[PDB]
Amino acid sequence: KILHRLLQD
Amino acid sequence: KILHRLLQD
Amino acid sequence: SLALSLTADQMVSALLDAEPPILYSEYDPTRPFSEASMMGLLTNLADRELVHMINWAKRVPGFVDLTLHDQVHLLECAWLEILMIGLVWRSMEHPGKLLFAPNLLLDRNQGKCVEGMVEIFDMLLATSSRFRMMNLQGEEFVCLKSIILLNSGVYTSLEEKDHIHRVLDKITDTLIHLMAKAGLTLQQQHQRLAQLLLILSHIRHMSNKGMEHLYSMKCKNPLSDLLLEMLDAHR
Amino acid sequence: LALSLTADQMVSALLDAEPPILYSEYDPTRPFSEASMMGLLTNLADRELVHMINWAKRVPGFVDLTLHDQVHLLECAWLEILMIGLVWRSMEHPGKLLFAPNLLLDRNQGKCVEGMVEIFDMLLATSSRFRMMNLQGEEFVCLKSIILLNSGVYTDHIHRVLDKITDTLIHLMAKAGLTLQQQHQRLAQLLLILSHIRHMSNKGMEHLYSMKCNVVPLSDLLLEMLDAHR
């Protein structure tokens, strides 16, 4: 999901 | 309203 | 009033004295378990429990000092929360199971039978586990239950706003008194107090979720009159 | 790593992680329709989410969780976190909701969207409640962190961090010169408000996936966070 990206970024 | 009545009687 | 005068041990005593009985279900274990029947069972149980809760709230210090209009408002807002924490309390010594009634003890498996219940089931189960590891005391439980009654509808001229807070403060003092008597250190008393109150945010959550489909279950399906009126109060 | 931090250090770390106050779109064109109002709020909330996700990573002990746990907590608490921020911003504006410095709304403007006004009242009541007891910023950041970690924990290390923020809250009250009784009373008052923030979130969420049923187009992210509540 999008939420995964923003967390790792 | 039943709740109102029971809170009285 | 009168509720401001009570000592900690006095309110514990009064609260313990006011405890409603644990009601039985009309559950016949010589039958399978359908979604409609089980929900009908829990509905019948909740309806009979409501009558005991109404008369229990009257015995909660400060509650009778409030107007009839406000007493109604507090109960309309917190009834399912109160039913749920009572359920969770009954199920403390029954790991993986919920004790709706002494003759009705279901696990997560039999919880699936109702569509969209297994999630609540797990939330109630986790709450009961939470109480278990804390070793929640009965004296603490009745305090939490009184808090829910007075706190849940308080945020929704009127002196009264502040009187409830004054009772809540006194109930906080009581919980601290209990924990100190248990021998806990001050840091331990503050942490445990926080821990107990944070659980009430989850009990609120479970109530909202539970209430949410009770008024979708109302479409179709088997509710009593008092239950319908208190369900009406939410949507 | 979060456990080894001190209370003064805990506060400073939280205050430093504070997300910025964003501005609404500067149309402004008033009054609003229910579509334009929901548009401004949806656009604002979506931009706040990106800052929240980064604020969360800077919450002590939050990066120590698995990526699964981080997601679950945020998915569970995002609206609560948005609301308590809104409530916090609106403290100095009694009877008003400060969504953005260029977007201040009263109860009446809440009637623009089909209630809305019900949530407005609950939000206004929470803001006044904060104003009454003089909620401090250091207390606020602790509460918001508590919401993040606690709201989705019932769905060890987290409870360990939760106890620390409790220790931190007490510290702040002992600093303010409150007596031991006034400390646990005030602590209780603060945490009970979280139950109401939860309630507002659930009521708000319920209407969010009833708006999706197509008043304003929602962002893909705001939809993801919304889908996580069934």
Ligand SMILES: CCC(=C(c1ccc(O)cc1)c1ccc(O)cc1)c1cccc(Nc2ccccc2)c1
């Ligand atoms: C398990 C709690 C139980 C209630 C309860 C009953 C007795 C207690 O002592 C405590 C809680 C409950 C069930 C039916 C009611 O009418 C009221 C409460 C309850 C409450 C709300 C919802 C559900 N399940 C559900 C229903 C329809 C759709 C999806 C899920 C279950």
Ligand SMILES: CCC(=C(c1ccc(O)cc1)c1ccc(O)cc1)c1cccc(Nc2ccccc2)c1
């Ligand atoms: C005021 C809170 C606001 C949210 C918000 C936005 C920005 C913040 O900084 C804080 C809170 C919100 C609004 C729109 C969104 O897409 C997401 C959240 C919000 C949240 C849920 C629902 C509604 N509107 C509504 C309510 C009932 C019925 C119909 C509509 C509004």
